[PDB]
């Protein structure tokens, strides 16, 4: 239940991200790495699954984000 995000704004702090992918699922793990790339965990299986597949190029704080 590791999905990488990536695309994300230099502002882009875990508080925003993990707010922005709460409409998919809860998370209980969220890091933000430089360059615009994080790793987060879900609770379920089932809100990662909606995660990767009702976020693909979702917008947030103006950059496109990514989920893999």
Known sequence: ?????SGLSDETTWHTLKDHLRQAGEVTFCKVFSGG???VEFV????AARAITELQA???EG???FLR
Do not use: G, H, I
Request: proline residues 6%; aromatic residues 0%.
């Open 44 to 47: 379920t299986p089932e809100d």
């Open 37 to 39: 790339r994080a790793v």
């Open 58 to 60: 979702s917008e947030l």
């Open 1 to 5: 239940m590791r999905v990488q995000v």
């Open 63 to 65: 950059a496109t984000l």
